């Protein structure tokens, strides 16, 4: 995931 | 995540996979060249366990998963007198 | 007649002209003013019937009230929400914000204050172009509206209009001599706001208005603002203004090219290389006036490459995506000085993408640089620590060895951030106390996850010593959760929150290793929260004893051997035996309850209210207070 | 048919069972229906009437294993220079094959062997790999391994996967031992390796000392140690990390303290900051390195 | 805390649901298990139809009548309407 949802 | 335990009569007792791996052989039957890592069927063919006692085995799976860590006067497992001595060797085969 | 006023307010908002006329029929002059002019509360908004009539665009209600009842257009009330608690706005301001031209014309003709000022010096023209209706903006300006009037942050009618995609009003305001050299609260002009909005039409009219490009309060040109916004169209229009000289236009081309290498929604390799090569071509073409860049020494976080000075170097790493991103980052911080708002955030996106394909080692060091700069900038990094602990948990679940000095420096950053939140909540008033406490709790939870993943990693002796030293420092800082839970309470609780990511695979509470580490660093083993529950009271209530009896036995014996008074009473006088709700935990505590005459004597002292103040050892007054 | 004890002919059920256990130890393909049907065959043999055939099943399985790993041993020894890659190719086939066969033989393990000196099939298959394939090849393996490690020191790039799997085989082959599971790995590999790396780094310390001053010897030594933390991370067991680093320290920076302590004077009294940092990291790990340098700095 | 044995002709599914849940959740579950959309399957109770609206709490699936050690059976019919044709379990042997 990471940048998929943690980026914001 | 739903293993399909077939019985001697074709009664496919679909049960939660985490529930069924409480038994050693079902854990072993899905380990090795029986994994089928595709989450499509994951079926197990018990060619020697009658359906009427495999159903009780599945109730035991659910009962054990529910009342594992509770130990707060757990209700007694209903084993009919006639189905015992079939459940005994069924749990011998399907360890625990 | 309070219910009648609410009915009048309800009728005007619902547009019931028939019901409003019936409610207001046969009413005296005092009754009319009481019914039309009272402030009513509904849905978190305190608005008058005339104010609420303009927001909903009920022209018939507005005309009926103004023509017959001649209600004054100076009513004040709380309007709108979502960051808008603006008070003192009249009915004209509400209609302008709602984009209703007919209500504005009716109000102004009836005597609305065109140059009305709210609490934050907001003009009705400011809200008129906020919605985006040209007729409302044209009507107010023709009705003697002062465009130069701004708020306390100096955002005029042109600046508020440039936020959105309303090309008609910004061009019209430029026709009415809008000042292009105005400075906002942070030294910002209208060009800064239009550059980040990605509106080439608004920006290109400002340069035709002789915008007089000047840096903001922080010291960045509006061209650089659009350069970091990955808006090539906005950037590639200032070259014809003939005022950027050569250094400013070539640093924007590099910044524009650098920004395309690190963006969630504007990432593309081909466009990034095209602009970066063009920036390098213009530097190394004239020869006599060749432009040379002052490259910083290679940061260990920024790989090992010290940019690409030679022209062959840039062409060689065109096919390498990693070097393409790395070269953009170095010039991204070099232009801004690595102390800007949006320097670390593109690095965070670069690492997160780099971690999505089983690559970890270079992902970590990028976030260390992001964590390092934000600490210098007094920026809270609770989300950064949370995602960092999540990535370590994902590594550990993947049985991957996590480097320990990174955990050490991240723990140092964590305790520094917790101290920053401590003195922040010391200085921050009730305005943002809820957000400050939320960030405080998040910081404590992330620190606990970091301690847990440190205990889940086999580290060296010196590394473990450093980690325990840092935990000792934070324990001496003595954090306190809003429930009064110290660090020990959260490490033994089962209600301690764990984020939905891979931390559930590694981090869990209560955890024996974390409690042992906290007790090793001299944590307050007898800490009492607001309710009264000690460190022992929280785990004797644990509801799953048999499943993880190892991690309940270990924590019980660790707490007891660390001096946790097993007979301690909360504010309700409940010993941990009483607050057990479990046979297993109760008996496991009873096996650790070394009965002492001191406990019985203290209980007998405090039971019958014997004055023990200063008549016993000072180490016994707190001991009696335990019971 | 039910789970009651029934009359079973061993010479036919075993033949119906050998075709599966022979194809699961080689990681071939066996259909899921056959694999699920075999679990009844071990059960039928283990509760056969009127005498359980658990002894016959275990003895025949042990005979088949010693006739299979020995067949693998001849093939691995058949290849002259490829014995490392032939061992690894026949180990990952057999390490997972032994685990799958242990899964197949679960009823035999938990109701005949564990209930009654006998080893479970998971333990037996591995213990019969270290008796018929490792130990006869022990001289060849821990000679070609150290040649590969020595070539890795020499700058060559061996197959990391093969060497790591072969070295990890020595500790995985004794994963079922309750007491000292790494005794074989330290006996067969670490002691022949720590002695080997000791000689190599003593030679390298003497060679570096013959062409470099103290301002260059320390940088090269720290280069070797930094590489040694990698040349042992991708080849050896995680328990061997601290032993190899500590042994290469006390062969290259603790056998030459006379060279380092004497040159510590000129390093400290001229503020050679780049050299002083390198000496401190070098002398900290040595047992008696710092207590002189400290003194010098104080002076 | 309700346990159900959803019955096909032979196929049986062992499901667990909350004390406050409706039929739509079980329809979604059997869609996720049997790969059958819920628009052609309707649940049952001792051979009488159930509607998608009402909850299982008042439907008769109380916590003390669908305990995990003895879950209550639930019918299931698939459109190819077809009547419920659940096959019972095997006959237990007589006491020896």
Author numbering:
A (entry chain L): -22 to -15
B (entry chain E): 17 to 112
C (entry chain H): 1 to 627
D (entry chain C): 1 to 116, 135 to 317
E (entry chain F): 2 to 81, 85 to 100
From the paper:
We recently discovered that FEM1B, a substrate receptor of Cullin 2-RING ligase (CRL2), recognizes C-degrons containing a C-terminal proline. By solving several cryo-EM structures of CRL2FEM1B bound to different C-degrons, we elucidate the dimeric assembly of the complex. Furthermore, we reveal distinct dimerization states of unmodified and neddylated CRL2FEM1B to uncover the NEDD8-mediated activation mechanism of CRL2FEM1B. Our research also indicates that, FEM1B utilizes a bipartite mechanism to recognize both the C-terminal proline and an upstream aromatic residue within the substrate.
To understand how CUL2 Lys689 neddylation affects the structure and activity of CRL2FEM1B, we further reconstituted the neddylated CRL2FEM1B (N8CRL2FEM1B) complex bound to the CCDC89 C-degron, in which Lys689 of CUL2 is modified by NEDD8. Although N8CRL2FEM1B still behaves as a dimer, the N8CRL2FEM1B particles display two dimerization states. While the architecture of one dimerization state (state 1) is similar to that of dimers, the architecture of the other (state 2) is distinct from that observed in unCRL2FEM1B. The two dimerization states of the N8CRL2FEM1B-CCDC89 complex, named dimerS1 and dimerS2, were solved by cryo-EM at resolutions of 3.44 Å and 4.09 Å, respectively. The overall architecture of dimerS1 of N8CRL2FEM1B is similar to that of unCRL2FEM1B dimers except that the WHB domains of both CUL2 are invisible, suggesting their flexible orientation. While the overall architecture of the dimers is preserved between the unmodified state (dimers) and the neddylated symmetric state (dimerS1), the WHB domains are not visible in the latter structure. Due to the limited resolution of C-degron peptides observed in all solved cryo-EM structures, we performed local refinement for the N8CRL2FEM1B dimerS1 to obtain a 3.55 Å resolution structure of the FEM1B-CCDC89 subcomplex. The structure superposition indicates that CUL2 neddylation leads to the disassociation of the CUL2.p1 WHB from CUL2.p2, leaving more space for Ub to contact RBX1.p1, which facilitates stronger competition of UBE2D2~Ub with CUL2.p2 for binding to RBX1.p1. CUL2 neddylation likely alleviates the inhibitory state of dimers by leading to the release of the CUL2.p1 WHB domain from CUL2.p2, which decreases the energy barrier for the interaction of UBE2D2~Ub with RBX1.
